Amino acid sequence: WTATSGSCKGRCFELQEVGPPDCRCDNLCKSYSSCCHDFDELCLKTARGWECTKDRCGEVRNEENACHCSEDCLSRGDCCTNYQVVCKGESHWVDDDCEEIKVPECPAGFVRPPLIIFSVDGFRASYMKKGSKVMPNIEKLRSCGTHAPYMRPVYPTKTFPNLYTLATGLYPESHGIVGNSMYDPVFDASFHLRGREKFNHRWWGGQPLWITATKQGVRAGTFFWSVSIPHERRILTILQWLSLPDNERPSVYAFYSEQPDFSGHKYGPFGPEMTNPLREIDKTVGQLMDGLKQLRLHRCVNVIFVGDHGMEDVTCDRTEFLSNYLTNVDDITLVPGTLGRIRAKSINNSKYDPKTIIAALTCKKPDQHFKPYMKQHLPKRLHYANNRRIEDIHLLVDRRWHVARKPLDVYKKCFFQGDHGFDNKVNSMQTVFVGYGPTFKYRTKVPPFENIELYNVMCDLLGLKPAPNNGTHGSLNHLLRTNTFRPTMPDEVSRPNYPGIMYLQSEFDLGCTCDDKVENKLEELNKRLHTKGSTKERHLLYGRPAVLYRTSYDILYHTDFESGYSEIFLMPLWTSYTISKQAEVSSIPEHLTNCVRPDVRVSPGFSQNCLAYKNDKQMSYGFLFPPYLSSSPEAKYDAFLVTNMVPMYPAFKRVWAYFQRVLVKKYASERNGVNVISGPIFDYNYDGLRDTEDEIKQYVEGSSIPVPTHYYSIITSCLDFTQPADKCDGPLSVSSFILPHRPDNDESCNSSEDESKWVEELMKMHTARVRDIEHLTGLDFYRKTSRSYSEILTLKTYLHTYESEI
Ligand SMILES: *[C@@H]1O[C@H](CO)[C@@H](O[C@@H]2O[C@H](CO)[C@@H](O[C@@H]3O[C@H](CO[C@H]4O[C@H](CO)[C@@H](O)[C@H](O[C@H]5O[C@H](CO)[C@@H](O)[C@H](O)[C@@H]5O[C@H]5O[C@H](CO)[C@@H](O)[C@H](O)[C@@H]5O)[C@@H]4O)[C@@H](O)[C@H](O[C@H]4O[C@H](CO)[C@@H](O)[C@H](O)[C@@H]4O[C@H]4O[C@H](CO)[C@@H](O)[C@H](O)[C@@H]4O)[C@@H]3O)[C@H](O)[C@H]2NC(C)=O)[C@H](O)[C@H]1NC(C)=O
Ligand SMILES: CN1C(=O)N(c2c(Cl)cccc2Cl)Cc2cnc(NC[C@H](O)c3ccccc3)nc21
Ligand SMILES: [Ca+2]
Ligand SMILES: [Cl-]
Ligand SMILES: [K+]
Ligand code: NA
Numbered sequence: 166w167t168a169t170s171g172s173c174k175g176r177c178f179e180l181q182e183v184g185p186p187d188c189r190c191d192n193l194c195k196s197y198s199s200c201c202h203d204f205d206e207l208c209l210k211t212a213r214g215w216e217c218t219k220d221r222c223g224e225v226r227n228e229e230n231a232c233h234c235s236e237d238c239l240s241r242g243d244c245c246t247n248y249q250v251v252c253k254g255e256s257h258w259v260d261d262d263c264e265e266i267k268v269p270e271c272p273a274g275f276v277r278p279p280l281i282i283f284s285v286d287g288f289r290a291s292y293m294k295k296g297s298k299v300m301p302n303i304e305k306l307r308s309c310g311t312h313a314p315y316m317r318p319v320y321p322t323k324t325f326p327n328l329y330t331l332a333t334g335l336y337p338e339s340h341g342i343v344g345n346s347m348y349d350p351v352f353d354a355s356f357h358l359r360g361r362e363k364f365n366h367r368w369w370g371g372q373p374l375w376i377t378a379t380k381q382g383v384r385a386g387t388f389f390w391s392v393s394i395p396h397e398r399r400i401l402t403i404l405q406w407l408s409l410p411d412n413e414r415p416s417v418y419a420f421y422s423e424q425p426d427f428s429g430h431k432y433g434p435f436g437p438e439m440t441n442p443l444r445e446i447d448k449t450v451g452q453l454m455d456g457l458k459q460l461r462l463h464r465c466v467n468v469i470f471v472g473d474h475g476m477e478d479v480t481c482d483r484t485e486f487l488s489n490y491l492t493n494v495d496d497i498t499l500v501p502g503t504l505g506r507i508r509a510k511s512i513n514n515s516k517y518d519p520k521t522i523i524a525a526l527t528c529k530k531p532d533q534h535f536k537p538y539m540k541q542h543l544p545k546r547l548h549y550a551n552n553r554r555i556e557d558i559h560l561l562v563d564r565r566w567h568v569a570r571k572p573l574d575v576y577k578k579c580f581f582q583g584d585h586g587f588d589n590k591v592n593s594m595q596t597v598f599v600g601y602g603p604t605f606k607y608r609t610k611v612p613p614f615e616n617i618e619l620y621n622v623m624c625d626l627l628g629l630k631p632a633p634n635n636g637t638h639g640s641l642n643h644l645l646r647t648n649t650f651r652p653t654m655p656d657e658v659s660r661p662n663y664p665g666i667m668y669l670q671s672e673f674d675l676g677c678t679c680d681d682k683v684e685n686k687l688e689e690l691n692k693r694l695h696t697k698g699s700t701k702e703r704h705l706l707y708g709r710p711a712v713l714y715r716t717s718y719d720i721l722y723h724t725d726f727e728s729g730y731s732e733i734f735l736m737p738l739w740t741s742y743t744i745s746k747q748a749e750v751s752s753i754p755e756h757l758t759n760c761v762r763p764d765v766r767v768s769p770g771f772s773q774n775c776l777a778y779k780n781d782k783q784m785s786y787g788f789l790f791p792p793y794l795s796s797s798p799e800a801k802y803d804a805f806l807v808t809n810m811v812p813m814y815p816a817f818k819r820v821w822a823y824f825q826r827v828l829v830k831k832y833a834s835e836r837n838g839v840n841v842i843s844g845p846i847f848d849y850n851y852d853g854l855r856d857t858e859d860e861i862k863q864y865v866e867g868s869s870i871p872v873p874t875h876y877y878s879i880i881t882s883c884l885d886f887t888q889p890a891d892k893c894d895g896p897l898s899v900s901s902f903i904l905p906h907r908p909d910n911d912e913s914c915n916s917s918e919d920e921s922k923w924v925e926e927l928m929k930m931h932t933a934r935v936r937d938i939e940h941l942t943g944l945d946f947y948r949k950t951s952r953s954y955s956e957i958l959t960l961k962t963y964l965h966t967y968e969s970e971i
């Protein structure tokens with residue numbers, strides 16, 4: 166109950182909310198049906214509209230007016246935004262030349278430049294160029310401030326997950342808002358866009374920016390705006406808050422616009438009807454900047470213009486129906502649309518089996534427009550698994566398509582022409598970022614970056630210490646004039662051992678064989694030097710990775726490659742090698758086809774054994790440094806060492822072999838040499854973090870050899886490709902992947918064909934940031950370069966998306 170009997174007099178858009186039965190006057194009261202009786206009359210005034218006119222200039226204050234054109238309005242902080250323009254001969258902000266803002270130019274009493282977040286729903290990245298003619302205020306922000314060509318949203322590219330990621334720096338799996346619709350089995354409760362349950366605090370994890378600010382003594386305007394409050398009123402309210410006295414005035418504010426998303430759904434991303442919503446957003450930005458200029462705040466405030474996600478063309482006729490695949494369709498619940506999530510309709514149904522559902526949905530139709538996954542098999546870059554609110558069965562839907570349970574759901578519930586929600590690497594899902602103000606750089610373009618990074622920057626902008634989050638703090642330092650965050654590299658936790666020759670061949674009873682007993686101080690001094698690390702400068706270009714946890718491991722040197730060998734996991738944590746543009750691919754010679762050699766630096770007790778692979782009918786093995794790329798026939802023997810061997814399903818070997826035999830050379834040829842670091846990943850609990858030994862669910866039969874869930878590679882070269890990878894003077898270029906180590910190739914519908922027709926497509930889908938690999942391995946890469954650490958952090962957050970140009 167709300168006794169709506171109090172008054173909103175002098176309380177309009179109060180910043181501190183009152184607890185019922187006292188009625189509310191805050192910008193959310195409408196949503197709780199809890200506004201005081203006079204809320205509309207006092208707080209949502211509209212009389213005379215939103216602009217001053219020549220005849221209103223110098224008028225006597227009439228409190229009924231929506232905004233004011235009287236002489237007292239400026240000090241009252243409630244002029245119409247165009248007051249000075251109409252009445253005092255000022256120019257609109259958009260008509261002023263831009264001028265570098267080198268320092269905050271704030272009124273006396275401001276302790277820090279305020280931050281205003283101007284968030285626009287569904288604002289696709291390509292609108293900045295394609296709509297430039299009709300958005301002059303936004304274009305001035307973009308060209309004069311710091312801008313990216315686009316900003317990557319999180320998956321799913323829905324509104325609530327992305328806005329909350331913007332506010333927290335967290336992946337949806339960590340903040341808990343994993344969709345616009347959700348069921349939490351622990352609460353036994355549902356979350357929807359419409360309704361009340363979404364207001365319950367138990368849905369919202371992490372620590373959003375307004376809470377971070379409050380806790381550290383920085384006041385925040387309220388971020389949420391009732392849909393019925395018009396945009397002009399939201400702007401005027403922010404401007405009024407900015408005129409509060411020093412002790413009450415917030416330092417952080419957000420505006421939100423439901424456009425252009427609202428019209429995009431109806432008309433498609435580029436419908437002719439889309440021009441007007443873009444013009445209207447621009448006019449709103451103009452109102453804010455004119456209003457800031459009137460208050461002498463236009464060179465004081467940092468403004469961020471940011472979207473949540475883009476918008477794609479999607480129509481009813483592009484719907485796949487699960488009823489065309491499943492006989493048991495009524496035994497499931499589907500969260501439908503641009504992603505699919507499946508669970509059992511009833512938990513008392515013992516016959517329900519996710520394995521058979523997956524199988525009935527796998528590669529059934531020639532041009533099938535969705536692909537089923539167990540959530541832990543989704544591309545790791547999506548970070549979409551470690552939350553009980555994410556169903557075990559997921560469908561990744563092709564851009565432009567929907568999935569639904571049955572046709573009745575689509576025709577009994579074509580209206581829409583646009584939607585969003587798809588894979589966050591999809592170009593149409595990309596959104597915008599512009600930062601403008603004293604703390605941002607002047608006339609600067611920065612590379613595309615992920616929205617998880619912004620929370621750290623907004624904290625930097627407000628002098629706040631960010632709560633723990635998924636951004637990489639410092640990776641966006643290049644956006645900022647000042648207030649940069651200068652992190653130190655993490656300390657190595659475990660130092661390596663450097664074993665020499667300590668074991669005789671006959672101490673090994675591994676069931677391994679090799680035809681190598683075919684034997685000179687010219688080349689024996691030479692090979693000892695290589696085993697001591699004489700070529701390590703060539704193969705370890707950026708220093709050895711640091712191990713950031715407690716473990717026991719050995720560095721192993723070889724002519725063609727260097728590795729950090731784990732005595733706990735019985736395999737390398739990493740293997741590093743450089744392949745020059747000129748390098749030649751050779752074959753595994755016939756006499757070495759099944760060769761595995763004991764490594765006399767590493768005890769039998771810390772080695773794999775060939776017998777376990779022989780006995781394990783499902784499990785085979787591969788090599789981290791590929792024999793195909795050996796520098797010479799003699800160096801090739803090194804690649805067959807038991808310490809270079811890793812467990813691989815035969816199905817996965819098809820992928821790995823094509824990567825090593827064909828793709829590495831191709832990249833070296835295209836990029837003028839590459840350095841590669843490859844290794845295993847163990848993530849059995851799908852939390853995106855390195856497993857401890859006690860978390861491993863699968864071993865090679867009869868052995869303590871743990872089976873990786875994934876294999877990574879990090880492929881680094883010179884950004885200036887006219888310089889060879891091993892002789893690079895400036896910035897680096899990287900692409901990486903985290904390939905799922907799967908016993909079948911069911912994920913690839915064309916895998917019966919030659920690897921040249923399906924492997925690269927699989928690898929593109931499993932593209933990764935180095936930072937993702939760091940989380941998954943507890944390793945820290947690029948420790949020894951000539952580059953600034955912030956630049957290296959930016960490199961580590963880079964994702965090679967393989968999408969064409971926006
Ligand atoms: C991205 O960034 C984020 C933020 O840094 C990273 O997430 C963190 O990962 C940490 C390491 O796993 C994790 O640390 C754990 O914290 C537990 C206490 O957590 C509570 O308190 C914090 C602080 O206020 C709070 O943030 C948490 O909020 C979570 O939980 C609620 C759900 O009830 C949600 O509202 C919220 O959204 C968030 O959920 C997310 O995280 C949890 C895990 O905490 C997931 O399960 C959810 O699915 C969701 O993703 C909590 O309120 C603490 O209990 C843990 O300690 C256990 O394990 C350690 C192992 O080292 C051990 O030392 C302890 O003794 C303890 O073990 C005991 O409990 C075990 C489990 O019950 C049991 O098995 C044992 O036998 C023992 O009895 C642990 O320290 C941290 O909470 C999250 N933080 C957040 C915000 O998510 C994330 O890793 C980053 N991602 C990537 C890819 O890098
Ligand atoms: C997303 N969103 C909605 O979907 N709304 C809605 C609509 Cl339009 C129709 C039906 C039901 C609902 Cl709930 C109303 C709404 C109101 N205010 C906001 N503010 C977002 C805030 O500024 C912010 C938060 C995090 C980071 C940057 C900015 N977001 C809303
Ligand atoms: Ca893990
Ligand atoms: Cl959803
Ligand atoms: K085998
Ligand atoms: Na297949």
Ligand SMILES: [Zn+2]
Pocket residue numbers: 287324426427430585
């Ligand atoms: Zn939408």
